[PDB]
Scaffold this active site. Structure first.
Site, short mmCIF file in Angstrom:
data_model
loop_
_atom_site.label_atom_id
_atom_site.label_comp_id
_atom_site.label_asym_id
_atom_site.label_seq_id
_atom_site.Cartn_x
_atom_site.Cartn_y
_atom_site.Cartn_z
N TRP A 130 -37.02 0.12 -11.03
CA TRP A 130 -37.45 1.40 -10.44
C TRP A 130 -37.73 1.32 -9.00
CZ3 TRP A 130 -42.82 3.98 -10.05
CH2 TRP A 130 -42.87 5.27 -9.56
N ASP A 211 -45.50 -2.31 -16.89
CA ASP A 211 -45.18 -1.05 -16.65
C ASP A 211 -44.77 -0.40 -18.02
OD1 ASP A 211 -44.88 1.28 -15.27
OD2 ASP A 211 -43.34 0.81 -14.07
N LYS A 246 -43.81 11.41 -19.74
CA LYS A 246 -42.40 11.69 -20.29
C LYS A 246 -42.72 11.86 -21.71
CE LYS A 246 -41.31 9.10 -16.70
NZ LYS A 246 -40.42 10.03 -15.76
C1 LIG Z 1 -40.50 2.51 -14.75
C2 LIG Z 1 -41.53 3.53 -14.56
N1 LIG Z 1 -42.75 3.26 -13.97
C3 LIG Z 1 -43.85 4.30 -13.60
C4 LIG Z 1 -43.13 5.63 -13.32
C5 LIG Z 1 -44.00 6.66 -12.62
O1 LIG Z 1 -44.29 7.75 -13.61
P1 LIG Z 1 -45.46 8.92 -13.08
O2 LIG Z 1 -44.49 10.05 -13.07
O3 LIG Z 1 -45.86 8.89 -14.44
O4 LIG Z 1 -46.37 8.74 -12.10
C6 LIG Z 1 -42.00 5.84 -13.60
C7 LIG Z 1 -41.27 7.30 -13.53
N2 LIG Z 1 -40.36 7.39 -14.26
C8 LIG Z 1 -40.99 4.97 -14.25
O5 LIG Z 1 -39.72 5.10 -14.54
#
Ligand SMILES: Cc1ncc(COP(=O)(O)O)c(CN)c1O
Ligand SMILES: Cc1ncc(COP(=O)(O)O)c(CN)c1O
Lengths: 396, 396
Positions: A130, A211, A246
């Site tokens: 990401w 993560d 999500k």
């Molecule tokens: C691998 C990963 N880590 C962290 C996040 C950040 O998520 P948040 O929108 O909950 O801040 C995401 C966003 N999809 C993600 O894909």
């Protein structure tokens, strides 16, 4: 003071949002940002969330400050999700959780924490990963190095290359692992592989940092945590940044948590007081709403029973769309085999499209995908599947 | 990795919260943390907030991501609050607002912004000031220097000393000013004084950074903004971090904003894209709830008419308690004149108690106040006024 400021380039992910509603052209299709959509192309607020929110509106009597680490029950419910209700980590009081503004916020507070109270200098991130991982760690002054992960030719996890890349990491370095639903490849290690890395990790002395943003999107709640649980049984210390954006459809409410694990109660407690100091100097205390919702749902069987089903529905619709995409692509004469797509977990498929192809798809057909060729399968519906597939085929 | 971590000392303000609910001793009185309390010692959620929240529950159809700078209407309504509906800043499109998790969050994003995209090295903070100011700026790698402010003997604003201290600040340094209700002294500059500093500031080349957390708690919405508005008419660039935690009773929802002002539209826009990059690498996008509430209230006359009255009530009750405290202190035989207290604005009175006295008040009488002798007048009620005053008198 500002005359010299150069404009920052648009965010590779969040920037698509602007472009998408900038072009008024009837049949645009948005396959960029990772947000769930139902059969009608809507991102509804979950029913359990609506129920929990009503309850909160009835029962809240104050908006008084939450305390640096947030709501206790929230912190407690998340640890049981991550580690399991049995778990020795929970019983030995080795873990401490802070409520944070989303998974991104949990990654930052962990970065700030490690940067001021530890001798960590460098964080190892998979290639690819990401995009915001780099920026978060660089914001805290840490250095990011990349480890081999994906085999483009075979659409496989290049384990040997993974192992061989990690060999350049020294004792005391942080290694980031995605719990499940690797962003953006959708390929995760098998449990046997998670086990091998659990062990390799203890001998080489790395500090694991998981993560976890898609718990529940691969096979299920408890199954998606297997890798992490394999590591926690073998490790003395570790950090985990999880997200509820999500699996609870709470994207904009910013709900996540940073879980700190140490050898014993006394140690995690000392370490944690510093994590709290890092939060105070950032945003003070976390936003209650999203977390209250999660806690009320998790705490009530009726509410929780309904939530697990809504989660199950989300995951199943995605698996449906995944197989449909592949079938329609072959049906539309795609000059290639896309079968590997069915093998990927989560919301995204690493399609293989080139930067140029994704550029053409957008400008010529109004089809939006990330530069890396990452496409949001969760944004596909039986209604846009055909226009989409024809756009792709006329680009191969 | 964590064996060496030293425990951080308890937060001087938020730490009182722990101690307070740690001692089960019947008649404890909490005059520490800055939270409003009504005649019954409760911190209720405002009626307009309850109304707005119901409306949101009825009308929200998604929890999809908000976009880095948050809700547009929110950003727009805040600028009109700060600068005024007429205002050339708004018409020339010179200002840009980002929705942030509280005023603290706005201070951090401004700190991170200035640190990565500017040549700022040091921030000037009043002495005394809110304790968390230092930590936030130090978190971003900036340096904090102190400027003389309060005359302890006279309980006056030592303007000459203020002016004379600021003379050591160079062109390009950031100077922090509290918009109104100075924390913790409660003493603010007169408009004439705000004017003198507005001018002195342009000649010496400082970048002003206003901390506005109590708009509406001194005399009124538009009046409390006078100092800031005096500066904005005279300055080409400036930053303002405002909070909605107190004036909307939204403490735990984390609602605030960071407003960036530059010479022209083109410049503020370039500078702002970097501010957005700093947010993305911190918490990604802000929590919707609290801000949606503020926006719905601000956008609806009925709702807004009711809010302004609730705010007026809060301010008036505090002014009542302020005069009552002084009268009961004299009634209880206080060996001193506390009249100056009536002259202070906002939630807090700099009482003058010594560190030892505040320590004794707590251990001996269960009366909680901040080490600096800052007492929360908004936490005083006709019911606890007598026990409180006797505790203080038996300590002088
Ligand atoms: C691998 C990963 N880590 C962290 C996040 C950040 O998520 P948040 O929108 O909950 O801040 C995401 C966003 N999809 C993600 O894909
Ligand atoms: C001067 C000042 N600035 C900023 C803040 C932080 O406010 P918030 O709780 O909105 O984060 C406060 C807290 N009262 C404050 O007093």
């Amino acid at each position: 003071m500002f005359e010299n400021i150069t404009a920052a380039p648009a965010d590779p992910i969040l920037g698509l949002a602007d472009l998408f509603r900038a072009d008024e052209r009837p049949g645009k299709i948005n396959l960029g940002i990772g947000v769930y959509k139902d059969e009608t192309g809507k991102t509804p607020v979950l029913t359990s969330v609506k129920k929990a929110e009503q309850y909160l509106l009835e029962n809240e009597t104050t908006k008084n400050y939450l305390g640096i680490d947030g709501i206790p029950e929230f912190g407690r419910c998340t640890q049981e999700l991550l580690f399991g209700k049995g778990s020795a980590l929970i019983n030995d009081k080795r873990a401490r959780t802070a409520q944070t503004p989303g998974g991104t916020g949990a990654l930052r507070v962990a970065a700030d924490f490690l940067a001021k109270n530890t001798s960590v200098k460098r964080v190892w991130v998979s290639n690819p990963s990401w995009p915001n991982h780099k920026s978060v760690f660089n914001s805290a002054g840490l250095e990011v190095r990349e480890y081999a992960y994906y085999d483009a030719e075979n659409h496989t996890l290049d384990f040997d290359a993974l192992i061989n890349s990690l060999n350049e990491a020294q004792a005391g370095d942080v290694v980031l692992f995605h719990g499940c639903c690797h962003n953006p490849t959708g390929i995760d290690p098998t449990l046997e592989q998670w086990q091998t890395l659990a062990q390799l990790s203890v001998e080489k002395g790395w500090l694991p940092l998981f993560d976890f943003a898609y718990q529940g999107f691969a096979r299920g709640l408890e199954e998606d945590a297997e890798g992490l649980r394999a590591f926690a049984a073998m490790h003395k210390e570790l950090i985990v940044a999880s997200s509820y954006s999500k699996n609870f459809g709470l994207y904009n409410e910013r709900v996540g948590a940073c879980t700190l694990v140490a050898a014993d109660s006394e140690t995690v407690d000392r370490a944690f007081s510093q994590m709290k100091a890092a939060i105070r100097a950032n945003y003070s205390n976390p936003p209650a709403h999203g977390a209250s919702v999660v806690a009320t749902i998790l705490s009530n069987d009726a509410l929780r029973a309904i939530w697990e089903q809504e989660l199950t529905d989300m995951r199943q619709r995605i698996q449906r769309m995944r197989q449909l995409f592949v079938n329609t692509l072959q049906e539309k004469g795609a000059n290639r085999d896309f079968s590997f797509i069915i093998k990927q977990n989560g919301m995204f498929s690493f399609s293989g499209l080139t930067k140029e192809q994704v550029l053409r798809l957008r400008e010529e057909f109004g089809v939006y995908a990330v530069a890396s060729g990452r496409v949001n399968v969760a944004g596909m519906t039986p209604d846009n599947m055909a226009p989409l597939c024809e756009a792709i085929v006329a680009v191969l």
